Structure 1
Amino acid sequence: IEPIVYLSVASREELVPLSEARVPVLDRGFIFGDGVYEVVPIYAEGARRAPFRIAQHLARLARSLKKIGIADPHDEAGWRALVARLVDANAAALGDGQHAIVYIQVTRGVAKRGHAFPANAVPTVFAMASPLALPTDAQRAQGVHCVTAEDDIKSVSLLGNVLMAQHAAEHDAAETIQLRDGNVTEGSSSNVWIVKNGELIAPPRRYALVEELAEECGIRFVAREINEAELRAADEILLTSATKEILPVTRLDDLPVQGGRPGPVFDALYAAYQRAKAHEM
């Protein structure tokens, strides 16, 4: 019934029901958005559950922590055990055959409000395991609609992304593709790619699953600025994230992308994605 979550505040840890998990009001994640997050997908085959790419996800988490000066509270083994206990404790909540997504957040901790790093704060850690519903077959068959709007760490200072996500909802679209000074940046909660003349293109920059899949398929990858015209004239437009896997974008601001049908680089990357998941299960 109720989700069970993990919370560590002032070095005290507990797995508790969601309705009992609360953090002190002076936690810097709440006061300042001063924290980082990472996600790990957990794919289910009956009662067999297996994290996908947990090493690479945890390595990006350690990097985000260091980039903002926050003491990493666990080594890799400690993080994996924290994830395994959390997933175990939600076995009933989730149920057999149910994929999950694990969300991990670490903030600089609790102290008197002052912008600079406090001398003696201990990091807060929050994690939870939620049901994951992947995009449907129909969605992959039809593709998704994106809109555009004016726009290197996974921080929780996310107001910008919240606003662009709301913008996409208000426009009946799956995602807002952002443009800064005429060039593509990213989605509100996804990475954006285009295909042109058989070449996979992303904006200029490691966690790099999509590049690894492109390398596997023998698809050439270039990292360069993608301007608004090149976006609108793409052969294909793609979204990627832990929860979306890869989705084809077939409408962009009410105009069709190319023929308005998912293309072959999408197909190739999607199949290579699923083989990497089979490999791990």
Structure 2
Amino acid sequence: GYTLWNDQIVKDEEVKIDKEDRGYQFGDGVYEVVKVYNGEMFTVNEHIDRLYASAEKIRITIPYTKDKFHQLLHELVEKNELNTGHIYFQVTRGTSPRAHQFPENTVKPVIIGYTKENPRPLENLEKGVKATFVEDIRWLRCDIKSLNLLGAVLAKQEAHEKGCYEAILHRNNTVTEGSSSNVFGIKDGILYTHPANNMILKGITRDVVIACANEINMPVKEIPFTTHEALKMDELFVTSTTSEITPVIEIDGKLIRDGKVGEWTRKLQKQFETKIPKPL
């Protein structure tokens, strides 16, 4: 395959990372993941906007305009002949002799991007998945989509060890988000999800789902709920660029209602399906 490296498209094996790349020594960088469906990038503008917002939050200046970044992604998808899967891309502050403080503005960011073929998780969407609650021990700027992902790594591993698809995180029993998703609960036909402050990532899929709820006249309340309240919900699901709307039918051996995917989850899945590129 081919990898985007700065503004060049290069054979994968030509790409070399420096040991003093600040992404490698400090996790000093930001990233995005964009889903591609039948050759078309879904919500690419929103992801590019969020990459630049994440970068700006940690004062990294991306050296290309958004239009040029968009063009590069297009070229990367075409060169790799990606049909259905995702583009991963990240920006780090660059390479400089190791020191905590920022280097001279003479240092250029390092941009890496690549593709992976990866089907829609149709089985999960239909049947739902199991999850587990795990304490949120992450830093307090979860609104920045950074490469500092070690709390999420440990949470995901714990979930995978329990045979669960996702770890639902909580700060002293207040549900925040998933180790790599946003978390929604439904009760009495109302959609609940934690508000977008410094405690969660403002997911692109989260935002599409809220729009879907508005389109079908389902009330949305962006207020947090507890782990104990979550267990009493009528329906629960998680969202991400790759997981789409993935129903959660069981948490830690306790069924959500009857352990079946709920009616409102299905309605949202139906509205979501209208937004994604189809062949054709």
- TM-score normalized by structure 1? 0.90
Task: Name the CA shift for 1:224/1:168 in 2 (closer, same or farther; >3 Å).
Answer: same
For 1:17 and 1:170, locate their aligned partners in 2 and report how far apart those are by CA, in whole Å.
36
* Aligned-partner Cα distance in 1 for 2:53–2:145: 10
Quote the residue 1:102 is aligned against.
87
Matched with 2:100 is 115
Q: CA deviation at 1:90?
A: 0.3
Cross-structure match for 2:36: 42
Measure the CA separation in 2 of the matches of 1:280 and 1:234. 36
Q: How many residues align?
A: 265
Q: 1:22 aligns with which of 13, 16, 19?
A: 16
Please give the residue correspondences for 1:184-199 in structure 2 after superposition, counting only pairs within 5 Å: 184-199=175-190
Q: Which residue type is aligned with residue 224 of structure 1?
A: I
1:87 is matched with 77
Give unpaired runs (5+ residues) of structure 2.
Answer: 137-142, 197-201
Deviations along 1:36-85, one digit per CA (max 9) or x if unpaired, are 001111111xxxx2111111111111111111100022222111111011
* Aligned-residue RMSD, C-alpha: 1.5
Distance 1:150 1:106, change over 3 A: same
The answer to whether the 8 Å contact 1:34/1:108 transfers is yes
Q: Distance in 2 between matches of 1:220 and 1:280?
A: 32
1:140 aligns with 2:121: no
- Larger strand share, 1 or 2: 1
Aligned to 1:200: 191
Q: CA deviation at 1:14?
A: 2.8
Match of 2:261 in 1: 262
Structure 2 CA distance for aligned equivalents of residues 115 and 79 of structure 1: 28
Determine the C-alpha separation between the residues in 2 that align with 1:273 and 1:126: 30
Q: Following the alignment from structure 1 to structure 2, what is the Cα–Cα distance between the partners of residues 162 and 63?
A: 23
What is the CA–CA distance in structure 1 between the aligned matches of 2:34 and 2:273, rounded to whole Å? 16
Quote the residue 2:140 is aligned against: none
- Aligned counterparts of 2:216 and 2:66: Cα–Cα separation in 1: 30
Cα distance in 1 between the residues matched to 2:273 and 2:223? 27
Q: Percent identity?
A: 34
Decide whether the 8 Å contact of 1:239 with 1:249 is kept in 2: yes
Task: Identify the residue that residue 199 of structure 2 maps to in structure 1.
Answer: none
Partner residue of 1:180?
Answer: 171
